């Protein structure tokens with residue numbers, strides 16, 4: 001997992017559960033609370049799993065519940081650490097921009113396997129976003145969408161269209177409907 005993104009999760013975990021829980025979890029994997037992750041660093045996915053596992057044991061919360069809360073609260077962290085991706089944009093533009101963003105930030109990473117997040121208009125007031133990844137982080141995905149709604153102050157409804165797993169890849173397709181139209185028909 002791209003290092004600087006893991007850095008945001010650590011900060012978000014501190015907001016949710018405290019410096020003690022987090023410091024203890026990082027210590028269990030040999031980290032240093034004051035460690036500064038660089039833009040070119042890649043953090044082993046298994047290390048992230050162990051960190052979250054420790055948070056789970058310390059807080060007594062299910063790992064999936066933690067990922068959901070981290071997704072919900074991480075949008076705020078992103079807004080502070082990567083302000084340029086926000087800056088006055090509207091929720092729909094933000095969401096449709098994510099697929100390209102993930103490809104960009106993992107361009108020069110060791111093996112590079114970013115989640116695909118293709119979004120496409122399906123109505124004047126809705127889009128279909130499909131999560132595709134070997135990691136199956138459905139809860140984080142759904143939480144980030146909820147948090148995006150809260151951050152941008154734009155009410156939405158999220159309906160699961162379908163989910164599946166094939167050849168190692170997990171897929172989750174949701175239909176996001178906005179309260180007000182965000183698209184108009186234009187000649188193709």
Ligand code: HEM
Nearest residue numbers: 001002005078082085105113114115133135137141144145
């Ligand atoms: C400005 C905000 C965001 C930035 C800068 C960002 C960047 C990234 C990056 C670079 C990763 C690590 C990927 C890797 O190392 O392979 C990641 C993970 C992930 N991001 Fe984002 N992200 C942002 C917002 C979002 C949004 C809004 C969604 C969903 C609607 C999303 C869904 C995910 C998922 C599900 C993962 C977990 C890894 C996986 O499932 O394979 N991200 N993000």
